[PDB]
Amino acid sequence: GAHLARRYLGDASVEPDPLRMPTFPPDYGFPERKEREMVATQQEMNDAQLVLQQRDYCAHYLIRFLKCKRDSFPNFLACKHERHDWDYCEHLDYVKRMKEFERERRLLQRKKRREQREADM
Amino acid sequence: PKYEASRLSSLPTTLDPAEYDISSETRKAQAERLAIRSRLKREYQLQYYDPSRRGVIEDPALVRWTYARSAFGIGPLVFWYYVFKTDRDRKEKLIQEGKLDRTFNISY
Amino acid sequence: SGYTPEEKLRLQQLRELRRRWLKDQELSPREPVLPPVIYKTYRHSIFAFTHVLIPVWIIHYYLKYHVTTKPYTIVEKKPRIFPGDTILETGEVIPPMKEFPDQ
Amino acid sequence: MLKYIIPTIMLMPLTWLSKNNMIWVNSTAHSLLISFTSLLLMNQFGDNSLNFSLLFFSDSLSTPLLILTMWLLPLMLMASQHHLSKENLTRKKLFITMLISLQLFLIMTFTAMELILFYILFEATLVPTLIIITRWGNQTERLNAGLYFLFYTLAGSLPLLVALIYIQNTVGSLNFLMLQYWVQPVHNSWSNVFMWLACMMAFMVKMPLYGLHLWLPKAHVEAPIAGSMVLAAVLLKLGGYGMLRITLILNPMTDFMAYPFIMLSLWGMIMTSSICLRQTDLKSLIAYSSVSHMALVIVAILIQTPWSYMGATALMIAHGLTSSMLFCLANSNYERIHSRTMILARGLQTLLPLMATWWLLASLTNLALPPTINLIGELFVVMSTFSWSNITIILMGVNMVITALYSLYMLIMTQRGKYTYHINNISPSFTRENALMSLHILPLLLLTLNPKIILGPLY
Amino acid sequence: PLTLEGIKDRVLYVLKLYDKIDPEKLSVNSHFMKDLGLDSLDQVEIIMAMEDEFGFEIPDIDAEKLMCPQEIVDYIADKKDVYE
Amino acid sequence: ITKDMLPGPYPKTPEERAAAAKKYNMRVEDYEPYPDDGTGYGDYPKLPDRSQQERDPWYDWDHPDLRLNWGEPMHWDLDMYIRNRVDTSPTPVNWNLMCKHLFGFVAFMLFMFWVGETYPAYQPVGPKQYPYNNLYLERGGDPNKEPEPVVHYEI
Amino acid sequence: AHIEPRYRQFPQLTRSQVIQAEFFSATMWFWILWRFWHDSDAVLGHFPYPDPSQWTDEELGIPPDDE
Amino acid sequence: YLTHQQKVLRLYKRALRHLESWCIHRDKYRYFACLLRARFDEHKNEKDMVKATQLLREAEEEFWHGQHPQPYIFPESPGGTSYERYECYKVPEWCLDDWHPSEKAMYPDYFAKREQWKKLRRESWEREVKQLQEETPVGGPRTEALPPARKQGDLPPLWWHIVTRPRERPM
Amino acid sequence: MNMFSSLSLVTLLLLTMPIMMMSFNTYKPSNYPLYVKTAISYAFITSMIPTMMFIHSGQEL
Amino acid sequence: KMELPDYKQWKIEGTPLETVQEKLAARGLRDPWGRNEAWRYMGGFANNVSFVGALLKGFKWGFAAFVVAIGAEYYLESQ
Amino acid sequence: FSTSSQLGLMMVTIGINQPYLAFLHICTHAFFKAMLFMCSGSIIHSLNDEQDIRKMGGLFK
Numbered sequence A: 001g002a003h004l005a006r007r008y009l010g011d012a013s014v015e016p017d018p019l020r021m022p023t024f025p026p027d028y029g030f031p032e033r034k035e036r037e038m039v040a041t042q043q044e045m046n047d048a049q050l051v052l053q054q055r056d057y058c059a060h061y062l063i064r065f066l067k068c069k070r071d072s073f074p075n076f077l078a079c080k081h082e083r084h085d086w087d088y089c090e091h092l093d094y095v096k097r098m099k100e101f102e103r104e105r106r107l108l109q110r111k112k113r114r115e116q117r118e119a120d121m
Numbered sequence B: 001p002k003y004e005a006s007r008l009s010s011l012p013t014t015l016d017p018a019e020y021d022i023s024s025e026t027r028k029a030q031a032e033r034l035a036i037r038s039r040l041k042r043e044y045q046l047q048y049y050d051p052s053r054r055g056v057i058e059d060p061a062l063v064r065w066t067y068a069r070s071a072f073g074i075g076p077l078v079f080w081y082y083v084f085k086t087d088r089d090r091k092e093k094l095i096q097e098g099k100l101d102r103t104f105n106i107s108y
Numbered sequence C: 001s002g003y004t005p006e007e008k009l010r011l012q013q014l015r016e017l018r019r020r021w022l023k024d025q026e027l028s029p030r031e032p033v034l035p036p037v038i039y040k041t042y043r044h045s046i047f048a049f050t051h052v053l054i055p056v057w058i059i060h061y062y063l064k065y066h067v068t069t070k071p072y073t074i075v076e077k078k079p080r081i082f083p084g085d086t087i088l089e090t091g092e093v094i095p096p097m098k099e100f101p102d103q
Numbered sequence D: 001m002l003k004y005i006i007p008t009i010m011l012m013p014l015t016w017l018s019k020n021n022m023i024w025v026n027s028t029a030h031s032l033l034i035s036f037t038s039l040l041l042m043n044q045f046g047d048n049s050l051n052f053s054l055l056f057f058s059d060s061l062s063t064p065l066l067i068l069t070m071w072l073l074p075l076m077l078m079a080s081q082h083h084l085s086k087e088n089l090t091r092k093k094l095f096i097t098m099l100i101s102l103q104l105f106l107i108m109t110f111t112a113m114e115l116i117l118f119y120i121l122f123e124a125t126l127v128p129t130l131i132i133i134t135r136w137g138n139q140t141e142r143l144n145a146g147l148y149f150l151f152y153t154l155a156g157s158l159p160l161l162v163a164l165i166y167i168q169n170t171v172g173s174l175n176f177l178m179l180q181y182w183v184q185p186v187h188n189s190w191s192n193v194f195m196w197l198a199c200m201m202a203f204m205v206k207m208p209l210y211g212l213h214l215w216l217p218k219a220h221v222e223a224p225i226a227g228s229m230v231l232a233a234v235l236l237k238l239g240g241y242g243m244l245r246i247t248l249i250l251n252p253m254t255d256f257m258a259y260p261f262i263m264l265s266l267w268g269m270i271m272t273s274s275i276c277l278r279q280t281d282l283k284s285l286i287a288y289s290s291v292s293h294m295a296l297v298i299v300a301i302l303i304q305t306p307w308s309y310m311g312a313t314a315l316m317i318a319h320g321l322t323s324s325m326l327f328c329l330a331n332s333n334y335e336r337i338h339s340r341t342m343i344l345a346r347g348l349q350t351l352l353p354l355m356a357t358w359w360l361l362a363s364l365t366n367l368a369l370p371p372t373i374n375l376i377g378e379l380f381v382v383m384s385t386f387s388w389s390n391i392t393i394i395l396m397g398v399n400m401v402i403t404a405l406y407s408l409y410m411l412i413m414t415q416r417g418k419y420t421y422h423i424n425n426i427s428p429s430f431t432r433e434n435a436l437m438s439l440h441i442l443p444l445l446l447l448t449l450n451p452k453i454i455l456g457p458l459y
Numbered sequence E: 001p002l003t004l005e006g007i008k009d010r011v012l013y014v015l016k017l018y019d020k021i022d023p024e025k026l027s028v029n030s031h032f033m034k035d036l037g038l039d040s041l042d043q044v045e046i047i048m049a050m051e052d053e054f055g056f057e058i059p060d061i062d063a064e065k066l067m068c069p070q071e072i073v074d075y076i077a078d079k080k081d082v083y084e
Numbered sequence F: 001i002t003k004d005m006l007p008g009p010y011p012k013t014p015e016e017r018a019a020a021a022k023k024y025n026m027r028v029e030d031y032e033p034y035p036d037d038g039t040g041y042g043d044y045p046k047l048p049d050r051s052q053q054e055r056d057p058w059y060d061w062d063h064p065d066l067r068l069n070w071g072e073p074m075h076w077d078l079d080m081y082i083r084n085r086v087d088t089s090p091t092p093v094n095w096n097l098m099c100k101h102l103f104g105f106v107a108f109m110l111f112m113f114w115v116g117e118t119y120p121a122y123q124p125v126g127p128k129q130y131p132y133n134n135l136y137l138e139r140g141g142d143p144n145k146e147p148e149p150v151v152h153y154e155i
Numbered sequence G: 001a002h003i004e005p006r007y008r009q010f011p012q013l014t015r016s017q018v019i020q021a022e023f024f025s026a027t028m029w030f031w032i033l034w035r036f037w038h039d040s041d042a043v044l045g046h047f048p049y050p051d052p053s054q055w056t057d058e059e060l061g062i063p064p065d066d067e
Numbered sequence H: 001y002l003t004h005q006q007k008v009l010r011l012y013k014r015a016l017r018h019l020e021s022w023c024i025h026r027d028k029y030r031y032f033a034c035l036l037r038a039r040f041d042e043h044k045n046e047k048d049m050v051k052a053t054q055l056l057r058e059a060e061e062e063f064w065h066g067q068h069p070q071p072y073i074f075p076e077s078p079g080g081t082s083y084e085r086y087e088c089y090k091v092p093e094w095c096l097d098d099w100h101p102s103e104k105a106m107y108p109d110y111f112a113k114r115e116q117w118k119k120l121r122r123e124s125w126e127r128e129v130k131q132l133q134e135e136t137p138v139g140g141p142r143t144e145a146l147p148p149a150r151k152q153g154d155l156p157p158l159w160w161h162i163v164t165r166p167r168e169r170p171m
Numbered sequence I: 001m002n003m004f005s006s007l008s009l010v011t012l013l014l015l016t017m018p019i020m021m022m023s024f025n026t027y028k029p030s031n032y033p034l035y036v037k038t039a040i041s042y043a044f045i046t047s048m049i050p051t052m053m054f055i056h057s058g059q060e061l
Numbered sequence J: 001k002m003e004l005p006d007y008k009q010w011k012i013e014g015t016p017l018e019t020v021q022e023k024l025a026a027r028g029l030r031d032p033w034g035r036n037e038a039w040r041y042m043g044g045f046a047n048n049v050s051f052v053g054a055l056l057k058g059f060k061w062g063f064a065a066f067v068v069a070i071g072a073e074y075y076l077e078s079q
Numbered sequence K: 001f002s003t004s005s006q007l008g009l010m011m012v013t014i015g016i017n018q019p020y021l022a023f024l025h026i027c028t029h030a031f032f033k034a035m036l037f038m039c040s041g042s043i044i045h046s047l048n049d050e051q052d053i054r055k056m057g058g059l060f061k
C-alpha cells in the first residue's frame, strides 16, 4: 500500500521504479561491501532437481528439508524444524529486498535534495 | 416509465391498450376465430379418437408449411479473398527474404 | 363462473371411466408370470480377484514383456540425489554440503 | 482386378436365376462374400502402387474407396428390399441389376490407370444412377431431379473430355503411372487457365462445390434409399478421387487458380452448415450436411499438402459411412410415417429406444467426436489449412460449432421431447433395420483402432 | 400417496381455518357463493390456499369453476390420478 | 392434398385474398400475405412474429410441446420460434435499458482493468536475486560463452 | 416406512441421525481449536514485518547530505 | 375473450403471488396481503364501467412496475423446475398392441382386462359419432365444448384419450 | 517402477470393466449401481499406492 | 387412514401472527387466514436457533474435547 | 454461481503465476462443493422437489 500512494499520487521521481532497481552503484555509500555467499553448489541443486525459481540463496535449507521429508515417510508431520529453517532464510532474504528498496528510495531523495542545493547555487 | 416493446421482447397483453376496449366488432371477430378453431378441432378429433385408425393424421397446414419453405453472394467471397490473399502475399514475401521463422516446421 | 349442468355431467361421466381405467392398471398377485460377514468378504474377495488381481496380472505381463522391451516406452524421472546419499548401483557416496553460516 | 470384376458380373445371373423368394438372400449373401475378398487389396507397398495390369491398378487412395464401394452393395440391398416388397419380380431383379452394374462401373472407375478409361467409367455411373432415381423414386419431381443431376454432370464432363484428349495429344499418354514421370509444369496463359478449369469443373460439380450444389438436395429428396446411400457415400467421392489424381498435372497453376474455389468452399461450408439449422426435410438436411463436409475435402485437395491429402482421404471414407447411416436412419422413420418432415414425428426415443442409440452414434460421428475417423480427417485438414493461412482457423472453428449445433438439433428434434399424439403406427424396430445401422457404425468405429489404412498414399 | 378421503379431509381442514367460513355450516357440497356468502375475491384466495396445501397450481380458467369443496376434491383427484 | 390446397402465387385481386384466407383456415380480415417482392413467399400468410413460448401453456394444444393446434396455419419461421430456440416473451426490464446496463457494466470494467495495468500494485522490495550469474547455465545458457558477471551484495 | 410422515408437525427423528450430527459438529470445532492453538501464525503472521523508517542511514549506506 | 370480472380476478391472484415472492416470510406476507385486498375492496362497487376499466389499466401498469423479476413458480407449473420432467416416462397405450406374445403372457390378467376396454371402445364409437352429428349445428361447432352422454349405456363422446391417458407419474 | 506403472494403469482399466460388462458377459442388472460404486471404491484404493510412492520419493513416469 | 391433528389447536396467540393482527386492527382490517399459518410457529417449530447459534453447533463438546486434549498434551510434555 | 465464482478465483491464481496453488484449490474445492450439492439434494428430496429457498426454512433441527 502506502509506498504506492506516494508514487502514483505524489512525486514519483523520489520513489523507486520496481522494474529498474537498483539505479545506483552497489558500492555507493558502502565501502567494502561483501558478496552474498552461496552454500549449495550448482551440481547439488541440479542433482536435487530443484525448481529453477527455488535455486536461490536459501537453496541449501530447502535441500536439507526435502531430504528429511523423504527419509521420514510415512511420517508427514516430521521435518517441521527443517521447514522452518528454510522459511526463515526466505524471510531474511525478503527483508534484504526491502532494504534495497529503502536504500534506493533514500538515495533518490538525497539526489533530489542535492538538486535544490545546486538550483539555489 | 412505459414499456418499450422490441422485436425480441413483446408488449405484455395486460399493458396493450387494445385489450381493454373490446367492441361488438372485436367480439364478433373473436367468435369467428373461435369457430374456425372449433371446426378444425372437431375434424381432428373425429380421426384422432377413431378406434380403427392406425397411421398419421396428415395435416394440410403442416404440408403447406413445408411446401412453402422448400420452394451477400459475391461480397463475402471477395472480402475473404482479399483477406487470405493479402495474408499469403505477406507470408510468402517473408519466407523468400528469410524473415519468417520456420525452424521446426516440417509438417504441412 | 361455476360449471354448467352439462359440464358437470360430462366431467362426472369421464371421472367414473378414468377411475375404472386406473383401477385396472393394478397388477394381479400372479403378475408378472415369469418363465422358470462371510458373505461380505467372499463377495468382496471374489471382486478383488476378478477386478484387481487378474487385471494386474495381465497389465504387468503386458508392461513387463511387451512394453518395457521397446525403447523409451516407460520413461522415469530419475531419482533425486541429496548430499549424503549412497548410490546403490556403484556404491558412490555423495559428499555433504559446505557448513552453514549460523542463522 | 478381374477377381473382383467377374464375381460382380456373376451377381447378375445369380439374381436372375434365383428362386423368386431367394433374390434378396442370394444377392445379399454373395455380395458380402465379394466384400470380404476386397480386403486382399490391402497389399500396399511403401514406394510402389499395386499395379495389376495395363488397365487397372490400386494404390492406397483407391483401395479404401473400393472396399467402401463393395461393402455398400449388400447394405443397399438390405435397405431396399422392404419398400420394394410389392414390386413385381422382374422389376425387383432389374433394380438389383442396376445396383450391381453400379458396383461394376465404380470398382473399374477407381482402378483404371488411363484417364480416358476413368472418364468413360466415371460417366457410365450416371446411367444406372439416373435410372434408379427416376424409375424408383416416389414423387413427381424425381423426373426433374434426374435432369438436374444429368445435365449438371454433362455441363462439366464434356469440357473434361476435350481437355483429356488434348493432354494425350501433347504428352502422348494418359496412363497415370506415365503422367507421374512425364508431367511438365503448367505455365501462365489463358489457354492453360481454361485447361485447368476443364480438368477440374466436372469434379467440382460432383463433390459438389458450393454454388454448384443445388442438384444434390434435389437428388436426395427424390431418390429411393439405395440411391441416396450410393450417391452420398461413393458418387460424391468420384469427384474427390478425380481431383486428387488430376491435380498432379496442374502444377504450378493450381497456386492461384485454387483461390476462388477455396473461397467458395471456405465460405460455403459455413453457409451450408447454417442452412442445416433451418431445414424442414430430414433428407434435405443430410444433403446439405454433405455439402458442408465435402467443402473441407475440396480445400484439402486444392492446398495440396501431405497432411491435407491424408485428411481428405479419411474424410471421404468417414463421411461415406456416416452420411449413408443417416439416410438409413431417416428412411427408417419414413417407412413408418411416410413423411420426410423432421418436425412431424418427435420424441421417438420413448418409442424406439435402441434406434435412438443409433441416432446418437450417427450424430456423434457427424460432429466429429474424437477419436472417430471423422475427427481424424477433419483435424488433419484443419491442421494443414492453418499453415496455408492462420486466419482459416476462424472459419474452421466456427463451422465446428455450427455442425455440432445442427447435428444435435437433428437428434433433439426427432428423438427427444414429447411424442406426437396422433402417430400410433410406430412399430418396434425390425432386426433388418438394427443390423443395417450396426453394419455402418461398427466398421466406422473399428477404423479408429487402425486409421492408417484410410489415410491414403501420403501416409 | 393421496386418497379420495385424504384429499377431502385436507380440503375441509384448510377451509375450517378460514375465518370468513363458519366451520359448522361447512360441508363438502357448500357453495362458496350461495351457501357461505363469500365473494369471488374470496374464492380466489380459497383456490390459492388449496394450491399451497397440495403444492401445485390450478390454472385460472379451471379455478374459477370450482365453487364448492367437492369440486376441488374432484379436480385434485383427477390431476393426481387418485381413483381410491 | 390437391394443388388448390397448396401455397400459391401472391394474391392480386380481392377475390384471390378471400380464397387464400379460406385455404389457410383464416378470416379474410386477418389474412395478410407477405409484401409482393421476389423474396418468394407467394400467398403464405404473414403471422405475428412471436415465440411459441408466448402461447398459453394451459390450453389443450394438439401438439403441447409446440403449442400448435392441428390445422392452424404455421408461422413461416416456426422452426426458429420453437421453445428451444428464439424467445420473444415480454421482459420485466425494457430491452433498451438492459442493453445499456450490460454494455455500461462491461465497458466500465474493461476501462478499470486498463487503469489497473497502468498503475499496478506491488510491494516495496527490490528484485529477487539468484546466484551463479542469475542461473546462467541452469536457464540453458551457452556453456562455451562466458556470461557477463552478475554480482549480488549483502545489505 | 420406519419414519412415518406427520401433518403440520415437527418430524420424527432417529437417535442415530442426531448423535452423528452432533459428533461431527463437535469434531469440526475441536479441529479448528486444535489447529489454532498450534498454528495461529498461519492466521496471524509467521514473521515480524519491519518498519523501514526505523532503519538508520548508516546501515542502508546513505552518505551524509553535504558530501 | 376474458370478461372484466375475469381480468380483475386474474390480476388479484397474480399480484398476490408476486407479493409473496417479495415478502417470503408468512407473517409479513399475511400483513401485506390484507392491505392488497383492501385496495381491491375499495373499488369493489364501482358501477361506472369506464372508471372501472381505468382502475384495472392503472393497476396493471402498477403490477408491471412492481412485479418480482424472479417470482416463485410451483415446480410442475409451466416454467418450474419439474415441469415436463416425467414426459419421457409417459408411453401411449397403443404401444402395448405391438408387444410380443411372450411379453403379453407375463401379464395375462392385465391384457384380458385391456381387451374389455378395447371392446367397450369399439362398440361405443358409432353412437358417439352420431351424438355429435345430431348436436352440432349446420355451421359446425362454434365452441370446443363437448357434451355428456344422454342415455344409459352411452359414453360421453370422445372419451378414450382422456380416460386412458398416461398417469402423471407413470414409472 | 513395475508396481507403480502397473497399478496406475489398473486404476484406469478397472473403471472401464463395468462398461465392458454391459456387453452381457457377466452382468447383474439387479444391482448394477452397487457394482459401479464398488469399482470406484476399489479404484480409489489402487490409486492411493502410486500416490503414496510419489509423496515418498517424488516418483513420476 | 392418516390421522390429522385437531384443527382447533391452531391459534395465532403467542406468535408473530398476533402482532400482524394487531397492526391490521390499527387500520381497521383483519387477517382471515391467520390460523392456517399458525402451525409454522408452534410445536417443534416454535424456537429455532439464530445464525450465530447455528454456527456454534457442536462448540460445547468440541471445546470440552479440546481442553482435555491440550491438558493431556501439556501433562505428557511435562514428563 | 458459487462454482463459477470459485472457478474465477482459480483463474486469478493462474493469472498471478501460482499454478500449484490453483491446483490445490481444485482439490480442496472438490470436497466441499460436492458436499454442498449433496446437502441441497437432501433438502430438495425431503421437500418433494422444491428448490426455491423461499419455501424452505426451519430445517436446522
Ligand SMILES: CCCCCCCCCCCCO[C@@H]1O[C@H](CO)[C@@H](O[C@H]2O[C@H](CO)[C@@H](O)[C@H](O)[C@H]2O)[C@H](O)[C@H]1O
Residues within 6 Å of the ligand: D016, D017, D018, D019, D020
Ligand atoms: C446353344 C447356344 C445357347 C446356349 C444357352 C445355354 C443356356 C440354356 C438354358 C436352357 C434352360 C432354361 O431354363 C428355363 O428358364 C428358367 C431358368 O432356366 C426356368 O424358370 C425359372 O423361373 C424363375 C425365374 O423366372 C426361377 O424360379 C428360376 O430362375 C427358374 O425356375 C425354366 O423353368 C426353365 O425351363
Ligand SMILES: CCCCCCCCCCCCO[C@@H]1O[C@H](CO)[C@@H](O[C@H]2O[C@H](CO)[C@@H](O)[C@H](O)[C@H]2O)[C@H](O)[C@H]1O
Residues within 6 Å of the ligand: D188, D189, D190, D193, D257, D260, D261
Ligand atoms: C471460378 C473461375 C475462377 C477464374 C480465375 C481466373 C484467373 C485469371 C488468371 C489471369 C492470368 C491469365 O494468364 C495470363 O495470360 C497472358 C496472356 O496474354 C500472359 O501474358 C502474355 O500476354 C500478354 C499480352 O497482354 C503479354 O504482355 C505477355 O508478355 C505474355 O506473356 C500472362 O503471362 C498470364 O499471366
Ligand SMILES: CCCCCCCCCCCCO[C@@H]1O[C@H](CO)[C@@H](O[C@H]2O[C@H](CO)[C@@H](O)[C@H](O)[C@H]2O)[C@H](O)[C@H]1O
Residues within 6 Å of the ligand: B001, F097, F100, F101, F104, F105, F108, F109
Ligand atoms: C464493484 C463493482 C464494479 C462494477 C460496477 C459497474 C457499475 C457501472 C454501471 C454503468 C451502467 C449505467 O447505465 C446507465 O444507467 C442509467 C440509469 O438507467 C441510464 O439512464 C437512462 O435510463 C433511466 C431509466 O430508464 C432514465 O433516467 C433515462 O431513460 C436515462 O437516463 C443510462 O442510459 C445508462 O447508460
Ligand SMILES: CCCCCCCCCCCCO[C@@H]1O[C@H](CO)[C@@H](O[C@H]2O[C@H](CO)[C@@H](O)[C@H](O)[C@H]2O)[C@H](O)[C@H]1O
Residues within 6 Å of the ligand: G018, G019, G022, G023, G026, G027, G030, J061, J062, J065
Ligand atoms: C476427535 C474427537 C472430536 C471431539 C469429539 C467430541 C464428542 C462429541 C459427543 C457428541 C454427543 C452429544 O449428544 C448429543 O448432545 C446434544 C446436546 O445438546 C443433545 O441435544 C439435547 O439438547 C438439544 C437442545 O439444545 C436437543 O437436541 C435436545 O434437547 C437434546 O437432544 C443430543 O440429544 C445428544 O444426542
Ligand SMILES: *C(=O)CCCCCCCCCCCCC
Residues within 6 Å of the ligand: A001, A002, A004, F112, F115, F116, F119, F121, F122, F123, F124
Ligand atoms: C501495498 O502493498 C499494496 C497492496 C494492494 C491493496 C489493494 C488496493 C486496491 C485499489 C483499487 C485499484 C483501482 C485501479 C487502479
